[PDB]
Assembly symmetry: C3
Amino acid sequence: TGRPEWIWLALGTALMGLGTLYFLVKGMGVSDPDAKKFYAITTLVPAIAFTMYLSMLLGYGLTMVPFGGEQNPIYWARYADWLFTTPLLLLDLALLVDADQGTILALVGADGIMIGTGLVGALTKVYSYRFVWWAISTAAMLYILYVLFFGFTSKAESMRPEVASTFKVLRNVTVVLWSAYPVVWLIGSEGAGIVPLNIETLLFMVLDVSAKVGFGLILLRSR
Amino acid sequence: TGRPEWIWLALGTALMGLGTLYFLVKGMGVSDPDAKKFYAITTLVPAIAFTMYLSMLLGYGLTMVPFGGEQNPIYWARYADWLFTTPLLLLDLALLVDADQGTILALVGADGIMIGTGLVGALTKVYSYRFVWWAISTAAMLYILYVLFFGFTSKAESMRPEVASTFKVLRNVTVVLWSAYPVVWLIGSEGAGIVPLNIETLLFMVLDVSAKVGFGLILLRSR
Amino acid sequence: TGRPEWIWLALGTALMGLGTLYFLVKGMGVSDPDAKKFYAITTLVPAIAFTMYLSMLLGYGLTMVPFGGEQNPIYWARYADWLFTTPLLLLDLALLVDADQGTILALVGADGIMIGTGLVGALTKVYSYRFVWWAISTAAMLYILYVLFFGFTSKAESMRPEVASTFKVLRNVTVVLWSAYPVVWLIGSEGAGIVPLNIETLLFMVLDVSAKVGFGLILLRSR
Ligand SMILES: *C\C=C(C)/C=C/C=C(C)/C=C/C1=C(C)CCCC1(C)C
Ligand SMILES: *C\C=C(C)/C=C/C=C(C)/C=C/C1=C(C)CCCC1(C)C
Ligand SMILES: *C\C=C(C)/C=C/C=C(C)/C=C/C1=C(C)CCCC1(C)C
């Protein structure tokens, strides 16, 4: 209880836990091979996120990266959580639109480079290079959202306004969800430094819960 | 030859090596696409295990984790071996019972969290938190064995006592094999500390050889 | 600009970048599910390689491994690049010859052990053990080239001299490409030490560009 952001990591850990159990209880009784997959993926996302947030809460997923003449603490576990949960989420969207394996491998591969370079930008001691990796990381994000924005609209083509409105909203939500992360990274203590550490943890905690748990609800509430 | 457990790591490395060659020689001459898979998986398990045990034998896979006011050495390579070989083993069992991709992804994902959290519990400097990760790690193990225990019995249903007895034994063996690991971790120098380090290495060495090599024999001795 | 090999890492980074864009621009307009895969794999190889070479260029992928009584710098990012790009390349060759999943899993699994043990040999402080891991790493390479040499010739069997000559050349090129790496490692500052560091970076830079970018051209120039 020495860090001023322990409350957020606690709420995050708890929310990730409750979300996991909900998906676990509701996931029992499914024998359809295709429905079981959507329940296995959406349930592992918060399961991984819960364990990652417990490490930060216990201070295990925190390190000191001396950049800018200061010992700015960097929660490396956050990127680990995104590394294992962002591809799983892309799989729920891929199977939804029924994209070919080529489209999937490109999205996953681009996601790894996005998170990969993103972590380097956070572990760099030179302040100028930190944003270099940020530019490449973000560039990989645009590609993911580009294919998603294109792959989603093509699924709701033809003529079905009632059903077409469903895929159009899920598309927009995804674009704004992924886009919020690089913005919080730029203004937080890991980029520019306008937002202090405690408020930074709050922003990412809201985005993770909204994605790992929140988005998992809207996705599995579809037939 | 300064550590009192170098003999066990030596025997382990040797046994993993002999097991690999046996599977490699016996694996030649297989053209059946489905039979080649069972030979590729069962052969990589000891191949990985052999390299992991050579690192501990040479002192490369050993670190000092100061917990409990002592510099207890922790063989991190052990978890690395389990991390890459436990999912492969689950694949031999999955293809055997012919489980759907949903069941497989849930088992693999739960296995990563099991080994993942398990390693954190071994790299924690706070004695109280070490067992917290142990509880979560074990909880992930129960899920794997739950689905296995359920998925295996369903394969030997209908009426075939002669063939049904085969799947019932492999099931029991797997339950007792995976269950032994968390017990050795709890009593060893990484948990409570009732068993010294040298005896701990012996227990895990017997379990690994029995699994990576021993279990690989019984599995490939089936038509 | 303090290291005498910054020029090579710069050229490498630039070449990896140009190669990526070329594959990215030329990869647009492909709707064939099978053709998109070959474009997704061949494009991620240089994309990963570009990011890995930018880390070494910026000094992020470099560490000091005290072996032989000297602080020999070891570019660990090189192995990371090979770790994520060598399996992707094997996939382009697998889908080309249309190998069964068993053959693929064995090649990929053997490739991980090859790069895995290879990195240990480069991070070992004992000069004698460095070559031990080199022997195992190379041994895993021979297996990959053995299956490749066997799997490639079988694709050009029957009677088609015009088309058969195509697969026979790609085979030979691959054998000589993979074989060059362990040779440069043995003579460089990471093994024997006959070749200085700056010349070592040049050799690997030529081999990586030839593989990640160069070989990617010849592979995608086939119908
Ligand atoms: C937790 C769930 C999701 C979908 C998280 C997504 C996060 C990102 C796309 C973050 C990307 C980053 C960028 C673009 C640049 C700085 C490093 C980040 C990882 C924050
Ligand atoms: C080597 C082959 C197998 C099947 C090994 C399995 C090992 C485990 C399931 C170990 C699990 C652990 C638990 C439950 C808690 C402490 C950390 C361990 C990894 C030892
Ligand atoms: C970058 C593209 C390719 C195909 C690179 C391949 C590299 C190897 C097969 C290197 C193998 C090694 C060996 C055999 C021994 C020392 C460690 C190395 C990784 C250099």
